Design an enzyme around this catalytic site. Sequence first.
Site, mmCIF file in Angstrom:
data_model
loop_
_atom_site.group_PDB
_atom_site.id
_atom_site.type_symbol
_atom_site.label_atom_id
_atom_site.label_comp_id
_atom_site.label_asym_id
_atom_site.label_seq_id
_atom_site.Cartn_x
_atom_site.Cartn_y
_atom_site.Cartn_z
ATOM 1 N N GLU A 39 0.846 -1.189 0.000
ATOM 2 C CA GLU A 39 0.000 0.000 0.000
ATOM 3 C C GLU A 39 0.885 1.244 0.000
ATOM 4 O OE1 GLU A 39 -3.917 0.439 0.189
ATOM 5 O OE2 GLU A 39 -2.679 1.980 -0.763
ATOM 6 N N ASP A 68 -2.149 -5.207 0.886
ATOM 7 C CA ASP A 68 -1.488 -4.148 1.636
ATOM 8 C C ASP A 68 -0.057 -4.466 2.066
ATOM 9 O OD1 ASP A 68 -3.701 -2.366 1.462
ATOM 10 O OD2 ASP A 68 -4.749 -3.657 2.895
ATOM 11 N N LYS A 100 -14.619 -8.024 2.284
ATOM 12 C CA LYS A 100 -13.237 -8.203 1.851
ATOM 13 C C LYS A 100 -13.006 -9.651 1.441
ATOM 14 C CE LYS A 100 -10.908 -4.289 1.993
ATOM 15 N NZ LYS A 100 -10.093 -3.900 3.170
HETATM 16 O O1 LIG Z 1 -8.689 -1.854 2.445
HETATM 17 C C1 LIG Z 1 -8.393 -0.761 1.609
HETATM 18 C C2 LIG Z 1 -9.310 0.311 1.516
HETATM 19 C C3 LIG Z 1 -9.079 1.434 0.708
HETATM 20 C C4 LIG Z 1 -10.188 2.467 0.757
HETATM 21 C C5 LIG Z 1 -11.359 2.226 0.058
HETATM 22 C C6 LIG Z 1 -12.403 3.134 0.121
HETATM 23 C C7 LIG Z 1 -12.271 4.282 0.879
HETATM 24 C C8 LIG Z 1 -13.420 5.262 0.948
HETATM 25 N N1 LIG Z 1 -14.354 5.483 0.000
HETATM 26 N N2 LIG Z 1 -15.199 6.422 0.469
HETATM 27 N N3 LIG Z 1 -14.795 6.774 1.701
HETATM 28 N N4 LIG Z 1 -13.699 6.054 2.001
HETATM 29 C C9 LIG Z 1 -11.106 4.516 1.597
HETATM 30 C C10 LIG Z 1 -10.064 3.601 1.541
HETATM 31 C C11 LIG Z 1 -7.888 1.515 -0.070
HETATM 32 C C12 LIG Z 1 -7.551 2.683 -0.979
HETATM 33 C C13 LIG Z 1 -6.363 3.368 -0.783
HETATM 34 C C14 LIG Z 1 -6.026 4.431 -1.607
HETATM 35 C C15 LIG Z 1 -6.878 4.807 -2.638
HETATM 36 F F1 LIG Z 1 -6.560 5.833 -3.437
HETATM 37 C C16 LIG Z 1 -8.065 4.119 -2.838
HETATM 38 C C17 LIG Z 1 -8.398 3.055 -2.013
HETATM 39 N N5 LIG Z 1 -6.924 0.421 0.005
HETATM 40 C C18 LIG Z 1 -7.200 -0.729 0.858
HETATM 41 O O2 LIG Z 1 -6.409 -1.644 0.932
HETATM 42 MG MG LIG Z 2 -4.367 1.129 -3.417
HETATM 43 MN MN LIG Z 3 -6.679 -2.766 2.817
HETATM 44 MN MN LIG Z 4 -4.595 -1.527 -0.328
#
Ligand SMILES: Oc1cc(-c2ccc(-c3nnn[nH]3)cc2)c(-c2ccc(F)cc2)nc1O
Ligand SMILES: [Mg+2]
Ligand SMILES: [Mn+2]
Ligand SMILES: [Mn+2]
Length: 200
Positions: A85, A113, A139
């Site tokens: 990540e 991640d 997930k």
């Molecule tokens: O478990 C994860 C989650 C996210 C993620 C997804 C959705 C949101 C969200 N949407 N609306 N409000 N919150 C937030 C985090 C990500 C992820 C990380 C960076 C990004 F640019 C996009 C998703 N990765 C991950 O590994």
């Molecule tokens: Mg990502």
């Molecule tokens: Mn994650």
């Molecule tokens: Mn991720």
Amino acid sequence: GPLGSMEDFVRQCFNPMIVELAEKAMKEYGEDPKIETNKFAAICTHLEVCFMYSDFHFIDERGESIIVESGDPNALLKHRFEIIEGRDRIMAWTVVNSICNTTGVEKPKFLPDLYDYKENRFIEIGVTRREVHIYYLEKANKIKSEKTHIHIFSFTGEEMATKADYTLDEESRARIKTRLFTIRQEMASRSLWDSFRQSE
Ligand SMILES: Oc1cc(-c2ccc(-c3nnn[nH]3)cc2)c(-c2ccc(F)cc2)nc1O
Ligand SMILES: [Mg+2]
Ligand SMILES: [Mn+2]
Ligand SMILES: [Mn+2]
């Protein structure tokens, strides 16, 4: 109390490296951190958890798993976790491919991640404003077949992890939960919490 901006909160309560990596990721997916602020804050939180998860965790000179709380310990120690990540798509997959080729572990279908060199497995981390048992299934149902380990944290202290295998000691995970609790409380004092919670 007065309503603060989530933008202000994120930049003040997260280190600039986290924020910068978060901004780049959103841009990469075509989103503006100055409009989608709750998403912005969520991404920062998830990143920090990923970093704290790997913090202070090495594999020793003898090849077992240890904890060092300084930067001064021994440069022959290898980090227990690889952090996937926070990297752009190209570099993230480059690292995954390298891992997969070296250890011979199976290639995941989506970017995870972390990779754990002790347990020899990828990890999917999650942070939810909802019930962990629910987020877990979401997930779990995306990854299809599984060698990828899932570990879910909530803001209220609950955890859920694959096969009840929690990977880290209690002390490490307590650090993470404390940080999440601190984030939640601080948001609440700026009257940012209720809105943030409902946006997930
Ligand atoms: O478990 C994860 C989650 C996210 C993620 C997804 C959705 C949101 C969200 N949407 N609306 N409000 N919150 C937030 C985090 C990500 C992820 C990380 C960076 C990004 F640019 C996009 C998703 N990765 C991950 O590994
Ligand atoms: Mg990502
Ligand atoms: Mn994650
Ligand atoms: Mn991720």
